[PDB]
Amino acid sequence: YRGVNTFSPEGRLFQVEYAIEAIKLGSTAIGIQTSEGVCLAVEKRITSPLMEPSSIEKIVEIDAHIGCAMSGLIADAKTLIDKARVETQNHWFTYNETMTVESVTQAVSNLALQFGEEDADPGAMSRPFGVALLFGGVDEKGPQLFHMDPSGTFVQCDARAIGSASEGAQSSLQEVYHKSMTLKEAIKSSLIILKQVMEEKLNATNIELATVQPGQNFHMFTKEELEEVIKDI
Amino acid sequence: TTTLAFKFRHGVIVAADSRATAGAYIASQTVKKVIEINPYLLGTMAGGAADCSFWERLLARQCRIYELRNKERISVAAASKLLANMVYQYKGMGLSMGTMICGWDKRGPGLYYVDSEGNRISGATFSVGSGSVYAYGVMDRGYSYDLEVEQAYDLARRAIYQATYRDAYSGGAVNLYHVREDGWIRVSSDNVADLHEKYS
Amino acid sequence: NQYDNDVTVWSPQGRIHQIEYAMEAVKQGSATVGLKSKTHAVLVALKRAQSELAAHQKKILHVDNHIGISIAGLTADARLLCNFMRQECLDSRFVFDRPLPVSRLVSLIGSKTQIPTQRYGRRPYGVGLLIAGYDDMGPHIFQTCPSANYFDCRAMSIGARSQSARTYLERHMSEFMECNLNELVKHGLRALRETLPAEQDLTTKNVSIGIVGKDLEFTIYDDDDVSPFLEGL
Amino acid sequence: FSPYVFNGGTILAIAGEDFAIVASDTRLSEGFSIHTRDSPKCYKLTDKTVIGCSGFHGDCLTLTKIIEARLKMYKHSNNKAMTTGAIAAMLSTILYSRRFFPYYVYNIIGGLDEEGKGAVYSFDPVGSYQRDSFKAGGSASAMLQPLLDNQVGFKNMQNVEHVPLSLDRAMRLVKDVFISAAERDVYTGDALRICIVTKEGIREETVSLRKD
Amino acid sequence: SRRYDSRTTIFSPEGRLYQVEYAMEAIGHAGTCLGILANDGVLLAAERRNIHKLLDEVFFSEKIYKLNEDMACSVAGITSDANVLTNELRLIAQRYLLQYQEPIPCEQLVTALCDIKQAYTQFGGKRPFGVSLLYIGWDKHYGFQLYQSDPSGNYGGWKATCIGNNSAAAVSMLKQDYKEGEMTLKSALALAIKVLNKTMDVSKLSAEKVEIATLTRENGKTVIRVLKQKEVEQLIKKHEEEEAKAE
Amino acid sequence: SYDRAITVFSPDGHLFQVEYAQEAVKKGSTAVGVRGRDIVVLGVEKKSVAKLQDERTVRKICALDDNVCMAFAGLTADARIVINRARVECQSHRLTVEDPVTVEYITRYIASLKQRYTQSNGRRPFGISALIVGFDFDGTPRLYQTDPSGTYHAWKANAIGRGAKSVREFLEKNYTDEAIETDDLTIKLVIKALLEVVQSGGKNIELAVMRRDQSLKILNPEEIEKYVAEIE
Amino acid sequence: RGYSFSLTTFSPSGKLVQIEYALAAVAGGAPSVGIKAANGVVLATEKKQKSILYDERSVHKVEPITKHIGLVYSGMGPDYRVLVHRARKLAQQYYLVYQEPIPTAQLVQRVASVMQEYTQSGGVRPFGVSLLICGWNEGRPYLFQSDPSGAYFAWKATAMGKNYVNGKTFLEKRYNEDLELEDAIHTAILTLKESFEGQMTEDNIEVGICNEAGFRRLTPTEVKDYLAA
Amino acid sequence: SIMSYNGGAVMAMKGKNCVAIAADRRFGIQAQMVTTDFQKIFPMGDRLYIGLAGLATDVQTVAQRLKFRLNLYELKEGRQIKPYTLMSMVANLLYEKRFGPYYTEPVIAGLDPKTFKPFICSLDLIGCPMVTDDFVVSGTCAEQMYGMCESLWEPNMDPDHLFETISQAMLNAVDRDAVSGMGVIVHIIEKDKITTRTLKARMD
Amino acid sequence: MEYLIGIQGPDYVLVASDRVAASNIVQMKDDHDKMFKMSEKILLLCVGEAGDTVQFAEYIQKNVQLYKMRNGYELSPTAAANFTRRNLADCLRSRTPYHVNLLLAGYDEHEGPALYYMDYLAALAKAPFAAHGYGAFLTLSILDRYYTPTISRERAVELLRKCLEELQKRFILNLPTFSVRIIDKNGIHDLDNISF
Known part of the structure; x- marks a missing residue:
């Protein structure tokens, strides 16, 4: 009944729509693009105190100049991250160059949606990935921020918010952000919107933050560095 | 071709010549036989140049994937086992490769020798190439573990110079490297004519 | 109810419903246009952005030095079809050292899109293309629908609200064969404007133009590069 | 049945401060005979790259077609034209894909x-490659390299300042070395083709050589 | 085709595999099986269901199966799935023997078969095997052994068990009247005769509606035997005599 | 080959097969885990001796590598499959990397296998949840929990299975630096927490303890009863 | 491609229903009989064609496998043909490997195992046939039955098909372990006669025997002679 | 040659209700003894055995594989194999590898399980049965063994005379073979008993 | 070539091997190890073609450790030896043989010490004493001349001394330091190396 690859009377794959619904269960992640760099902020969402907050790897680096932030399922990302990384490295191997951001987003996007039931592979993928990613990095073209959806649709964004509170977060990001921000101001605005959404009171322990700039490689904010930003925040 | 590398109190030094030959014809005197796998791993090239470069570059890609997955750098032993397992799938199929992998791991400075026939060992000092036999004597007589940094530099340079002198297939310039806790550096690239002038 | 769950289940009226739903998916996309004169062929497109901070989605791609397309529908399907077209054109150049005639490429496209709609569990390509090319027989414009049915048009307009565009096109079909490149591009822009919803004007931020001709490889105009074409409307 | 056959030809590239030259003869031969007289060995890849192929002609032809296809593919996918380093790396990879049935082609990019x-x-047939300031390959490599080393490199000459290599002196040296190669090498010497890569674009110049 | 698919390998809305549950429901109607591990033997006591005057006597048994020189098993469920599983078990034993030149230990074997069964109930779209096994054997690791398996793929070592019809009642007496570590082979056989006489409520042990097996070590090597008619009837006469004296 | 899509998305975005897998996980005996200064301890609940099962063939805490162990709660056959797969991967890691495996690596591997079976064709998700404990080469104590969806986290004290909410609340109220100072205090803490679901204790529990180099410790019934008494 | 899912599945009562329906089809066929005499084994079925236009010799129901073992059925026809072919092939494979005639117990085991596969395999339905095999292996007669479920039973004497319950009652009345071949075949002929609905002409029944001499069908003149009594 | 790599010999003889089968003990690599305790005749039934001369790896592999097949057969049929069926079994096992064969030349010897009527036969390395009524030989010293058997063989010999004759042939064919020997181990098969004797053989 | 020697006693098993990794007129290593530790009570000595040896040894070692860890108990010496022989034979006739000559040792609670000899053609043998390489030709006769079934352990070390010193005298290659190891009921011990 109602195969995976089926078209609704509106012209939408059902499985794709349901996959787009699963992105609301996920925590809220933000990304802002500025000339001085691009920043990622996400909510770790510590359910109970008993668990190590450091063990929620919910931002990872694809390359020294790329960064990824996700929302949706934990398990669904892992394969997309590995694909993104092996593609970056493959490009470096062949061309001795650095894989651009739009290209890694495109490759990851293609890898999505190649799901089916009939005559594919001994173990090919069945249902669409239920995760929405955020690629941000510095390329030969400067700071970039790209947003991906389970439909294999990707677009470069100036500021985007994905996750359970993506609406409202987006209105805030739209009211604040302008074309001439600074990286530090971007961190401040992002942390403030996050604080505004999370149920819990913001602290250095229940978030992660990462920025990538032309000079420094992808950077993870440390507990003390997080406190330093949050105190004035 | 002559390549050289020895562990000692202060790290692992690397030195090599820069000559390529096609029969009796000198194809280039500016090759880079010290391959730079990463900021912490080095690899020399002996035998088939294309094989060494291609397989060492695959190793670099694998190491980067590993450090990116686990969040920690690969060991010298792990990198070497990976190369050996990569080339053993072509035993008796015509590959030529002779390499020393060297870095600074959690176990300290490391130096592994990997070949195309499948060998993989660790040692204090190595030298592989056509001028290897001409360099082993100079190393063995001069080598010491507690040897100072300047003294280690001198020993490596003299060994490669002597190998160049007595061997018809090795020559050019002697590049020399240092491998430390922070990573490797490049020390000098001294032409053999200048070294002849210095030692005579 | 039970005749619109699979693509291999004929409906008692001689209609396959899944193919029609795929047509719907193609009709829900943003507007696009195509023209041909005796000398050139021009595509004119209308990108749209999910939010006010995100970019407007690319909807013209390259195939060869003498062919171009303009998509409308699920992107992933469009990307798959672009891959196919480019591989076919490259194979023609490698084997025959010669550009692939356009008609043959459209035929291969139709045949490739035909297999899905006759096997159980596979689904129609939910994308609608507008191929513009220039062969030894001169300019060409084609259209492709999810049903593997291609059309040799002289002007068309697929996508959402595209019917007013088609009306304007059928209105001025006499001039297209004698027009200059500028007049042709202005006809296309004007129609795609007829498609726009009242209080919304053509801007550099929501238009892209493609052109191919006798001594002119396929080239894409977008962003400020489109301003010279827009200035004059 | 031997699948290869040596087809002669020589190719030469020398790099400068703001220019590059790739040059080749235009003879094709098989055994003691001479196939044609207008077969240039230097092919244009991008607006700032040229590659010369010598060796087995079928392998040369297949390889250059493969290169053009790969370059088109990359442009489509990454939305920018390749660089000289990108083509060098891609060709090292292409060539090693045949370690066990190698291309019989000597390649030199400029x-x-x-x-x-x-x-x-410069490239070995199996893929190994290295960056250089001047190289020659093919039938007259051995008699071309030493003079370039002497003049461009200023080797073995003392009390002579190391003047930078201008474009005029480069064209002259290329022409002269090709005259000598034609004088003392049967496989080459039909007509000289010179491609000059510079910021404005690629120019072509031709010079006639002695037929036999 | 999804219309005719049965989905024999998918979870229910409370995390229970239904096809497995029904498979175990089939077993609860086939012949009863009994396990008793003595200190000097192991013994299988199932009921001979093929009770007709027009059946012929063939083979050394009808429900007991040899698997190696040092291992045997009895079956409850479908006869045909039983044959398939027995064949695969024999193959596993011989493959281990070929690789190591040592007889396959008992939990080596039982877990190999149960792994096949579990995999079969995990993916593939087939129906699961409706068989539950009882095994017996000796190996230098744990001595005399008595295992059991189920359609799920779970097994268990049992000092005494019962899989099949009236399993609850048989295990109830087996709990009431088992001396852990204080059982000779003879006492275990008598306990089996008693428990079965209860369970096979239809008439009494006819010495022909029953099957008994013994695994022992004799002269340093395993010896497997299926009790003949005379000894079985003598045991039953002894049982009735003991019960009569008891009353 | 059978190539139907068992696990499939549903309106409102739910993997019902995954949800039913964890509903199965909720039908297994409670397992517990705590992390101390220098000792980890795994605690399970035995359903019943039955006086006729051989508890040696019924083990519920298993070792994957000399320095890594695991406990599960759910179906048994799936648990056996995952344990064997993890064992193979630990040994392959030893052979290729020449360094001992680490707890996060194997937890990641097991979680990936679960996700794979959750997104493949013709495959039913594992209805098992794991608790991996151990010490890396650096000698740091570690505790990870893997759900049937393929998600994993690190914990100081989590309980998995039947009655998990109660035991998790108990550990969350009680876990403090005081209770990990003495290895006996930690063992007794785990014993007490378990003792909020099980009835008998001593003959109705199993324990496991592991130290830096000390191999896996199985606590015998007499010693466990003595530990409960000392708690008494 | 082909369905990769089993079409026989367990029911809530733990019964594979499709096998039950196959058994129903078997019980609704033509009668059949088999007895194991002390010095031979006899099979016999009924072949009542539908009109005078059917060639009795066109096809046979009692078919041999080798020179010394043969079988008959009751159920559907085409399934019986398939199983005859598979049995002959398995017999020839056994002979090729072992260079000795296949024992009846093993051929029955092998054909039955082939019968199980179709109860569980994907996209297939059970055979609607039960067979009886007769052999003379090890100087000793053998009589086996094999049903759609893949189960086999060794029989001293049996009767399957339509009205098989009454036939089994008859045979229970008339078995005597010291029976002789001619008496056994006579008793069989009777059992078929217990319910037949007509006159048993020579051209409306079949029989086949096995002894030391070898399994071999009976020619109709022989059948008429035996039917004389 | 390949057979000479490890040497080795086997023999089989017949008598009145008995059969004998003998093989040497040496195992070496070209011209160096490695052990004098190598086993070549393999137990295969109550009164059925099998000897294999040729390559030691192949002797061991074939013995293990054949025991695998025979074990499965007996456990699936509930009866011991009879000699002829075993011979056909080995013939199919060897012939399955007609291209890339096993390098052994098996000899079979065992009384029937019911009439106890003698039976010996020999097989090529690609499965050619050869049944005789007097004797069969195989190994590297085959010709010496023919010379001895023809002269020392007579029909209807009791177990004592048979054992003497077969031992004499075995010892006297080894002494003139340089790469087989250092011990002879004899099996004599009768209806009731099995006798295994080791003979005083030159160790040179 | 490489050298191996094993002497088996009523309680122990003594094993040794050279510590050289020469490659074309150059002794590239002096402290190499040809001994692999199968388990806590089984060892594996391996010599053969460069590259094949370590691969085959690591494969077998991994499988044996995985067995021990899957089951709760370790494989026996004889079972492990037959497993290894079966793998070598199976690979013999494939597209990728292993050129490996092996000396396996181990102890068992019942059978006792186990020294197992195996050549590269997949022939197995159990012997009181065995050897491999070219040195076998210059040390086997000594083992025959001064070996008794009940030989004490110290006498075993002395006998191996005779063998190594003869290998020094009459051989052609240079084996300046050797490995020595003994397995007993109490595990494995590494004895100090016999050198000159």
Whole structure:
């Protein structure tokens, strides 16, 4: 009944729509693009105190100049991250160059949606990935921020918010952000919107933050560095 | 071709010549036989140049994937086992490769020798190439573990110079490297004519 | 109810419903246009952005030095079809050292899109293309629908609200064969404007133009590069 | 049944401060006979790159077609034209894909780098490659390299300042070395083709050589 | 085709595999099986269901199966799935023997078969095997052994068990009247005769509606035997005599 | 080959097969885990001796590598499959990397296998949840929990299975630096927490303890009863 | 491609229903009989064609496998043909490997195992046939039955098909372990006669025997002679 | 040659209700003894055995594989194999590898399980049965063994005379073979008993 | 070539091997190890073609450790030896043989010490004493001349001394330091190396 690859009377794959619904269960992640760099902020969402907050790897680096932030399922990302990384490295191997951001987003996007039931592979993928990613990095073209959806649709964004509170977060990001921000101001605005959404009171322990700039490689904010930003925040 | 590398109190030094030959014809005197796998791993090239470069570059890609997955750098032993397992799938199929992998791991400075026939060992000092036999004597007589940094530099340079002198297939310039806790550096690239002038 | 769950289940009226739903998916996309004169062929497109901070989605791609397309529908399907077209054109150049005639490429496209709609569990390509090319027989414009049915048009307009565009096109079909490149591009822009919803004007931020001709490889105009074409409307 | 056959030809590239030259003869031969007289060995890849192929002619032809296809593929996918380093790396990979049935082709790339300077890359048939300031390959490599080393490199000559290599002196040296190669090498010497890669674009010049 | 698919390998809305549950429901109607591990033997006591005057006597048994020189098993469920599983068990034993030149230990074997069964109930779209096994054997690791398996793929070592019809009642007496570590082979056989006489409520042990097996070590090597008619009837006469004296 | 899509998305975005897998996980005996200064301890609940099962063939805490162990709660056959797969991967890691495996690596591997079976064709998700404990080469104590969806986290004290909410609340109220100072205090803490679901204790529990180099410790019934008494 | 899912599945009562329906089809066929005499084994079925236009010799129901073992059925026809072919092939494979005639117990085991596969395999339905095999292996007669479920039973004497319950009652009345071949075949002929609905002409029944001499069908003149009594 | 790599010999003889089968003990690599305790005749039934001369790896592999097949057969049929069926079994096992064969030349010897009527036969390395009524030989010293058997063989010999004759042939064919020997181990098969004797053989 | 020697006693098993990794007129290593530790009570000595040896040894070692860890108990010496022989034989006739000559040792609670000899053609043998390589030709006769079934352990070390010193005298290659190891009921011990 109602195969995976089926078209609704509106012209939408059902499985794709349901996959787009699963992105609301996920925590809220933000990304802002500025000339001085691009920043990622996400909510770790510590359910109970008993668990190590450091063990929620919910931002990872694809390359020294790329960064990824996700929302949706934990398990669904892992394969997309590995694909993104092996593609970056493959490009470096062949061309001795650095894989651009739009290209890694495109490759990851293609890898999505190649799901089916009939005559594919001994173990090919069945249902669409239920995760929405955020690629941000510095390329030969400067700071970039790209947003991906389970439909294999990707677009470069100036500021985007994905996750359970993506609406409202987006209105805030739209009211604040302008074309001439600074990286530090971007961190401040992002942390403030996050604080505004999370149920819990913001602290250095229940978030992660990462920025990538032309000079420094992808950077993870440390507990003390997080406190330093949050105190004035 | 002559390549050289020895562990000692202060790290692992690397030195090599820069000559390529096609029969009796000198194809280039500016090759880079010290391959730079990463900021912490080095690899020399002996035998088939294309094989060494291609397989060492695959190793670099694998190491980067590993450090990116686990969040920690690969060991010298792990990198070497990976190369050996990569080339053993072509035993008796015509590959030529002779390499020393060297870095600074959690176990300290490391130096592994990997070949195309499948060998993989660790040692204090190595030298592989056509001028290897001409360099082993100079190393063995001069080598010491507690040897100072300047003294280690001198020993490596003299060994490669002597190998160049007595061997018809090795020559050019002697590049020399240092491998430390922070990573490797490049020390000098001294032409053999200048070294002849210095030692005579 | 039970005749619109699979693509291999004929409906008692001689209609396959899944193919029609795929047509719907193609009709829900943003507007696009195509023209041909005796000398050139021009595509004119209308990108749209999910939010006010995100970019407007690319909807013209390259195939060869003498062919171009303009998509409308699920992107992933469009990307798959672009891959196919480019591989076919490259194979023609490698084997025959010669550009692939356009008609043959459209035929291969139709045949490739035909297999899905006759096997159980596979689904129609939910994308609608507008191929513009220039062969030894001169300019060409084609259209492709999810049903593997291609059309040799002289002007068309697929996508959402595209019917007013088609009306304007059928209105001025006499001039297209004698027009200059500028007049042709202005006809296309004007129609795609007829498609726009009242209080919304053509801007550099929501238009892209493609052109191919006798001594002119396929080239894409977008962003400020489109301003010279827009200035004059 | 031997699948290869040696087809002669020589190719030469020398890099400068703001230019690159790739040059070749235009003879094709098989055994003691001479196939044609207008077969240039230097092919244009991008607006700042040129590559010369010598060796087995079928392998040369297949390889250059493969290169053009790969370059088109890359442009489509990454939305920018390749650089000289990108083509060098891609060709090292293509060639090693046949370690066990190698191309019998000697390749030498020449163009401009991303900062506007010259770059020259040489290749072994199996893929190994290295960056250099001047290289020659083919039938007259052995009799071409030493003179370039003497004049461009200023080797073995003392009390002579190391003047930079201008474009005029480069063209002259290329022409002269090709005259000598034609004088003392049967496989080459039909007509000289010179491609000059610079910031404005690629120019072509031709010079006639002695037929036999 | 999804219309005719049965989905024999998918979870229910409370995390229970239904096809497995029904498979175990089939077993609860086939012949009863009994396990008793003595200190000097192991013994299988199932009921002979093929009770007709027009059946012929063939083979050394009808429900007991040899698997190696040092291992045997009895079956409850479908006869045909039983044959398939027995064949695969024999193959596993011989493959281990070929690789190591040592007889396959008992939990080596039982877990190999149960792994096949579990995999079969995990993916593939087939129906699961409706068989539950009882095994017996000796190996230098744990001595005399008595295992059991189920359609799920779970097994268990049992000092005494019962899989099949009236399993609850048989295990109830087996709990009431088992001396852990204080059982000779003879006492275990008598306990089996008693428990079965209860369970096979239809008439009494006819010495022909029953099957008994013994695994022992004799002269340093395993010896497997299926009790003949005379000894079985003598045991039953002894049982009735003991019960009569008891009353 | 059978190539139907068992696990499939549903309106409102739910993997019902995954949800039913964890509903199965909720039908297994409670397992517990705590992390101390220098000792980890795994605690399970035995359903019943039955006086006729051989508890040796019924083990519920298993070792994957000399320095890594695991406990599960759910179906048994799936647990056996995952344990064997993890064992193979630990040994392959030893052979290729020449360094001992680490707890996060194997937890990641097991979680990936679960996700794979959750997104493949013709495959039913594992209805098992794991608790991996151990010490890396650096000698740091570690505790990870893997759900049937393929998600994993690190914990100081989590309980998995039947009655998990109660035991998790108990550990969350009680876990403090005081209770990990003495290895006996930690063992007794785990015993007490378990003792909020099980009835008998001593003959109705199993324990496991592991130290830096000390191999896996199985606590015998007499010693466990003595530990409960000392708690008494 | 082909369905990769089993079409026989367990029911809530733990019964594979499709096998039950196959058994129903078997019980609704033509009668059949088999007895194991002390010095031979006899099979016999009924072949009542539908009109005078059917060639009795066109096809046979009692078919041999080798020179010394043969079988008959009751159920559907085409399934019986398939199983005859598979049995002959398995017999020839056994002979090729072992260079000795296949024992009846093993051929029955092998054909039955082939019968199980179709109860569980994907996209297939059970055979609607039960067979009886007769052999003379090890100087000793053998009589086996094999049903759609893949189960086999060794029989001293049996009767399957339509009205098989009454036939089994008859045979229970008339078995005597010291029976002789001619008496056994006579008793069989009777059992078929217990319910037949007509006159048993020579051209409306079949029989086949096995002894030391070898399994071999009976020619109709022989059948008429035996039917004389 | 390949057979000479490890040497080795086997023999089989017949008598009145008995059969004998003998093989040497040496195992070496070209011209160096490695052990004098190598086993070549393999137990295969109550009164059925099998000897294999040729390559030691192949002797061991074939013995293990054949025991695998025979074990499965007996456990699936509930009866011991009879000699002829075993011979056909080995013939199919060897012939399955007609291209890339096993390098052994098996000899079979065992009384029937019911009439106890003698039976010996020999097989090529690609499965050619050869049944005789007097004797069969195989190994590297085959010709010496023919010379001895023809002269020392007579029909209807009791177990004592048979054992003497077969031992004499075995010892006297080894002494003139340089790469087989250092011990002879004899099996004598009768209806009731099995006798295994080791003979005083030159160790040179 | 490489050298191996094993002497088996009523309680122990003594094993040794050279510590050289020469490659074309150059002794590239002096402290190499040809001994692999199968388990806590089984060892594996391996010599053969460069590259094949370590691969085959690591494969077998991994499988044996995985067995021990899957089951709760370790494989026996004889079972492990037959497993290894079966793998070598199976690979013999494939597209990728292993050129490996092996000396396996181990102890068992019942059978006792186990020294197992195996050549590269997949022939197995159990012997009181065995050897491999070219040195076998210059040390086997000594083992025959001064070996008794009940030989004490110290006498075993002395006998191996005779063998190594003869290998020094009459051989052609240079084996300046050797490995020595003994397995007993109490595990494995590494004895100090016999050198000159």
